[PDB]
Design a protein around this ligand. Structure first.
Ligand code: HEM
Ligand code: HEM
Ligand SMILES: [Ca+2]
Ligand SMILES: [Ca+2]
Ligand SMILES: [Ca+2]
Ligand SMILES: [Ca+2]
Ligand SMILES: [Ca+2]
Ligand SMILES: [Ca+2]
Ligand SMILES: [Ca+2]
Ligand SMILES: [Ca+2]
Lengths: 674, 671, 355
């Protein structure tokens, strides 16, 4: 895909960047115990390069990971959009997608609680088209000018740069309680959507209303929704906290691994499509990025299949350097007057100057289009092209009038939707149609299951208990109470404040489909899910049991790790490095029962801790072989428990256990407020 | 101070642009109330442009770190050994700024990664800024600066997928170590508790390289810098470090910030070993070799002065992120040596600052400015903040009367290269044969650790090497380890199911050296700032009473007390939900809370797990006011286990426990 | 001077933009281009760019950050910094505000207003307002530049446009390039004039201070240097900048003939003690005369002081009774007449006109 730019160093002698063969292991010195020489060009060119390896991280979404793939249209969508990548059944377009968190720096953990980025580039035959989305369909704020306010408040306090990758601090909660537009996205972030199981188990949203524009000039309003084919799944928070420590790279490794095993993730790329006349017909403003269109009002239309199936070759050159923009738009798509979208258009083009250090960032291989470029952009640092046209101005006769202007009527130019208009005073005023900050947060909350509502209450209890200011906590309870009195009361109980009296203005009992993780049912596939088989080297029969289970589980696409005290043939990990966060399900072979009853080879109680953690976090757990009471009793796990398995038969064990992996989380293990 | 003049107050006032025009910044300017945003909105663009350009490249190494301000005070007039002005009078005070860091992780990675640590100290002297850019480990992995990108590429994440973050626990790193045997000494230090210090305040600082002290008479001696912590030496255990990395990525930077805010600013004795030039090869190794220590048995420490950190930064980005250290920041009375690692360092820091700063005037940033007048003919460059009056910035000149004048050994207190230094021989890219012993000193270090300490180091190698996928690399690793110690090779091999190679006794010996063991360095000299978690309950008014009584006592003794319970209230600091044993140096359960050892308010078994984790990790643990200890399977008779009804008595015992800090008898040993 | 970074975006309360599409786009360009020149976002912190009033805002970090901000809650809305900085607008804090009567209506368009379509009437208004010699200089500048255009098609196209402003301009310009002017197209032709755009017609300069007088003398005659010293004194009293030129330097002589040129002066005076100069290893052949001849050809006041003028004026082919040509024995009289010439500045009757 980027093959033309690959450089192979599997053979050959070391050279400088100008092809002179050199060495790079010893400095040139005046005598064998002497000082290093300035004329040592080998030294300086190597170390200069090292000294300049780093570039600024992204201003937001610094922590992320990407892959290559393909998009395939399901139809000729001419009748709603002129977009060339959507113009024929089965038409394929290369893509590159980067997934990310938002607040943390480079090196922060994948499993922080946060909003997540989902940025997709389509390398179309009419130009690169980017959809720079999130895993949450609504954004915290209603105007792009407020972005630095939100991001400063969420990022570490600027005197000490604490805390990393967290909203659990005063400034964040100050900003949320002072700027009530934040409530919708806040509720999404405090749900399981803030701690997704993987990039593959979350959806992608464009967030803004866009337009689809036909070649005839007519337009429709659309929301983009990439629907995961892997299912929806979350971590529980305690698990996420441990994962952040045991494996900061969890989501990137999950994605890398899925692709390497031939399980590249897929999404249906969908739109909700509505008429221009419906911009205010649903009880909120389609220009308002804090609002979703309930699916009950506008169903999803499936446009095509996005599949990621190839890992990068060099992370820096591909993933770090990819530079997305919502201004990478193509004929057949247009913007709307969403004031958050509007300002974003400016930001990305500007910020790439920061990261790239020069204006020719579109020439990096990962940013290049797959079609010819014809324009009069010239010079600038890092200019890689040698332009032949020595008359780069329009209008010209000296280059025969080329490049020619492209527009609606010639050359398949981009054109602004011609029905679009503006009217009125030039104003720095918010539309009153944006004013309801609370009803949709409530719709969202109402649409969660009881244990899901508990998880969200508990996320808020955790974070808000860490806010030092009493005045901020009181202000937070005031806003939450406008969404739900019950939420305010329950959160309040953890922070020892009283919740304010019910304010019923925005309370209601309405629900909407497709926003619950817990209610979205068992996963449609268990391929890639991780099973840890806890064994022992003390009994050759425990090793045999583990091996027979491996074969049965691997047949069904599960990734199996056998854990023992020490490595040997067929054992993947030691107890010392194993952790329940490395598994979606844990199985102890009954031959290993004695380790669940001290060693220099792992921390005291390690094997039992893995089992107990896995149980506590809702995972399917079991003992294979017929003798289960010793393990289950030591773990305080009831034999009759849902998602707890005990069978002698390896075949029977696996059939049951696999039903449990698809259920994914056993929610009856979590206490609920009365 | 350069910094006071540049402080900006925003506690009052109307919002302005950067050019002082009063503006607003909350709503974009639009063509109608539901209209598109206008290009003429300068308020929006200046604000968003600044935001879009907030970030600067992280440091090529040591990207994760934290800094503080303080003071250095000389104990004496050190004229007799060095011309250095900051050392020339008893009591002479010099402002400092220090940044501490890990090495491999990017700027958002966890403090409690296993790693070498940076300890970089700037002395803003009355004769120029002087930087000692040091580490918490006295020896480095490699013998020539030109190898730095090889080491660092091998330790940093694999470049196809940028996995794993802030860890040597992967194939490439151990491939490099096993192929480049010079790495063994630092590797042993990193695999010891020195890789996971309890805080920046509980680690020492080392210049690593041999430097020179140069007198005004031109004579020189060879020196090693050693900053000796007054807080004592202390480490985490590895499992605690891993949990910490998830529960509190900011642990060391928070520890330092809080210590300073509480009037407990950390101190170090700034020391040197000092030996004659004639002793460069007298100790069985070459003092130009940065992989070797001078054992204290051969050269004792001279205490030069006190380093105290006692003021936090005002703006982390402007001060901590922007500080730009250089070993090239040297002053009269100090010189370099021909250590090939130090020699190449000199080039790197100057150049890399161009990358971070984006232009050449990085010494003009307030944190990088000196505290004396600057007189030179450096001009222009992006971001030029001075307006130079001298319009003849060339030497020699008559049109500016000869100024600035040249400074040298005999004029203007100039820097001067030590005059006894010479060079002789072919111009070579050859390694001195005197650098060839890569294994004796790693063995010396290992010999010098206590039995449990040797166990921990073995277990660290077992943990990391078990994560190496390549059978060939694992075998190569055992080959090198075996050259240091056959027993280490055997014990590590056992975890990975490989056989160790036969004993190779070339470099084996039984020698030991003082001052390198953490476990053996005795109880801590102070317990101020150490953290006590008191686990209580809102159930029982008596539980809260007990907790508050303990609090009064413990806070007077300088300890940071956290009372934990199901929910927040008067006198309760933290909920069970947010509490973790990694948050505490000691754990006390008050008698009234015995019931807690299911709720919607915290995860199942959280109270007990905190007590159990704290015991497993070696902390002093106790019950103030049988059942709790039974539930936790903690022996009542155990070392560092306290069980008392008397509060006074409990406090007195528990505080001895905090000094002991770790009860190492709780850890299994190979036999 | 190199680092000053101007922006039309640097506006203050009491001023606003208009929808001039040239202005509108400029607002983007200056802010963006300063990133290029400065290499980072903190260019407003360079001394030359700083304001002379306090700055209160939540802009942070960036390469080259020179401030140490005390406010650790740089977001709005906040309570943790008591709501500061406060928003400024029309009603509070003397904020900038967009003129409130401004509106927009209509389609979102990449279309030119037809009101912009007359590209020729005002060029004609400007041309009509120049004096005859001034019109000639403009024709001559076009003749110079267009004669260097290689493409015959481009030259034809240029005549087509010039002819829409003025048939006569097109005819005169065509004459120099060997092409024919197209037939007159009178759509935008008119005879109107406007005040204050002509240079030649703007009258004598209001001040001659700073204007440069070159006095050409010789070291061959003590008399010539005495004349130049006297002339210097009289001229300097009036704030003119005097350069005395001779073959070599000595006290009272500023410049050798070798480095002197008529372009260095607004008026040129030869002292008659120096008439003999009007070959040497000390300057190029004919240099002293060429300085005088050039100054005369370029319209400058020129003269001979001392009473003996015919030798110099005749060698220079300069008529003794020409306008802006002076000859007097009296230094006072010479200077009084000469200073009138300096205010006149250029004697335009020395330039040929198309007939
Ligand atoms: C609907 C709300 C928004 C969504 C879904 C969104 C999405 C994203 C995503 C997914 C990335 C990372 C792209 C990548 O992987 O490289 C990103 C980066 C960025 N965003 Fe946005 N964003 C939104 C609002 C904004 C606003 C309002 C601004 C500023 C006005 C903004 C400025 C940026 C900047 C400066 C970056 C770094 C881009 C780069 O360095 O290439 N974002 N955002
Ligand atoms: C004795 C071995 C060494 C020690 C003790 C050492 C110590 C340090 C420390 C403490 C920092 C962080 C300073 C800060 O807090 O900002 C640092 C940064 C750096 N080091 Fe060294 N280092 C050593 C070897 C080298 C070598 C051999 C090179 C290259 C040839 C090198 C190149 C760098 C660079 C490029 C940075 C980033 C500096 C900046 O951005 O300001 N280091 N090192
Ligand atoms: Ca905060
Ligand atoms: Ca969930
Ligand atoms: Ca740059
Ligand atoms: Ca258009
Ligand atoms: Ca690797
Ligand atoms: Ca230790
Ligand atoms: Ca001197
Ligand atoms: Ca306004």
């Amino acid at each position: 895909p980027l093959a033309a730019y690959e450089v192979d160093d599997s053979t050959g002698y070391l050279t400088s960047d100008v092809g002179g063969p050199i060495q790079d292991q010893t400095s040139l010195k005046a005598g064998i115990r002497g000082p290093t020489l300035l004329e040592d060009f080998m030294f300086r060119q190597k170390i200069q390069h090292f000294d300049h390896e780093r570039v600024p991280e992204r201003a937001v979404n610094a922590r992320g990971a990407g892959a290559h793939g393909t998009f395939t249209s399901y139809a000729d969508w001419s009748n709603i959009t002129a977009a060339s990548f959507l113009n024929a059944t089965g038409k394929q377009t290369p893509v590159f997608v980067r997934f990310s968190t938002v607040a943390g720096s480079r090196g922060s953990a994948d499993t922080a609680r946060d909003v997540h980025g989902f940025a997709t580039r389509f390398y179309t035959d009419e130009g690169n088209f980017d959809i720079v989305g999130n895993n949450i369909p609504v954004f915290f704020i209603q105007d792009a000018i407020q972005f630095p306010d939100l991001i400063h408040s969420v990022k570490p306090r600027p005197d000490n740069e604490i805390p990393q990758a967290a909203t659990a601090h005063d400034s964040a909660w100050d900003f949320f309680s002072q700027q009530p537009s934040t409530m919708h996205t806040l509720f999404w972030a405090m749900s399981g959507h803030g701690i997704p199981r993987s990039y593959r188990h979350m959806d992608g949203f464009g967030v803004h209303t866009f337009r689809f524009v036909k070649d005839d000039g007519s337009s429709k309003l659309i929301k983009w929704h990439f629907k995961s084919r892997q299912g929806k799944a979350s971590l529980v928070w305690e698990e996420a906290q441990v994962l952040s420590g045991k494996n900061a790279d969890f989501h990137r490794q999950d994605l890398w691994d899925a692709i390497e095993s031939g399980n590249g993730p897929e999404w249906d790329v969908c739109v909700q499509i509505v008429d221009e006349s419906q911009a205010q017909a649903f009880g909120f403003d389609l220009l308002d990025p804090t609002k979703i269109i309930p699916e009950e009002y506008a169903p999803l239309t499936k446009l095509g299949l996005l599949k990621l199936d190839r890992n990068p070759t060099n992370y820096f050159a591909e993933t770090e350097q990819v530079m997305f923009q919502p201004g990478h738009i193509v004929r057949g798509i247009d913007f709307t007057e969403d004031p958050l979208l509007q300002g974003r258009l400016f930001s990305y083009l500007d910020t790439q100057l920061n990261r790239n250090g020069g204006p020719n960032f579109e020439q990096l291989p990962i940013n290049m289009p797959r079609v010819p470029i014809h324009n009069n952009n010239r010079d600038g640092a890092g200019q890689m092209f040698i332009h032949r046209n020595k008359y780069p101005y329009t209008p010209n006769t000296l280059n025969s009038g080329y490049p020619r202007q492209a527009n609606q009527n010639a050359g398949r130019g981009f054109f602004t939707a011609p029905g679009r208009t503006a009217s009125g005073a030039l104003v720095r005023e918010v539309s009153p149609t944006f004013n309801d900050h609370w009803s949709q947060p409530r719709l969202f909350f109402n649409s969660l299951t009881p244990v899901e509502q508990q998880f969200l209450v508990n996320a808020m209890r955790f974070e808000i208990s860490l806010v030092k200011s009493e005045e901020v906590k009181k202000n937070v309870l005031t806003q939450l109470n406008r969404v739900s009195h019950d939420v305010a009361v329950r959160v309040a109980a953890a922070i020892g404040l009283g919740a304010p009296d019910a304010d019923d203005t925005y309370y209601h009992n309405n629900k909407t489909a497709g926003v619950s993780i817990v209610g979205s049912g068992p996963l449609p596939t268990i391929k890639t899910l991780r099973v840890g088989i806890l064994a022992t080297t003390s009994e050759s029969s425990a090793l045999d049991q583990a091996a027979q289970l491996r074969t049965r589980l691997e047949k069904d696409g599960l990734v199996v790790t056998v854990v023992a005290e020490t490595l040997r043939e067929g054992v993947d990990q030691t107890y010392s490095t194993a952790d329940a966060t490395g598994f979606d399900g844990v199985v102890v072979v009954d031959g290993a029962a004695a380790l669940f009853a001290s060693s220099p080879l792992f921390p005291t109680g390690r094997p039992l801790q893995i089992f107990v953690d896995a149980y506590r976090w809702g995972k399917p757990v079991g003992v294979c072989g017929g003798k289960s009471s010793e393990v289950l009793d030591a773990a305080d796990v009831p034999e009759d428990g849902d998602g707890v398995y005990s069978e002698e038969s390896v075949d029977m064990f696996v059939e049951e256990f696999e039903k449990g992996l698809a259920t994914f989380r056993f929610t009856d293990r979590f206490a609920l407020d009365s």
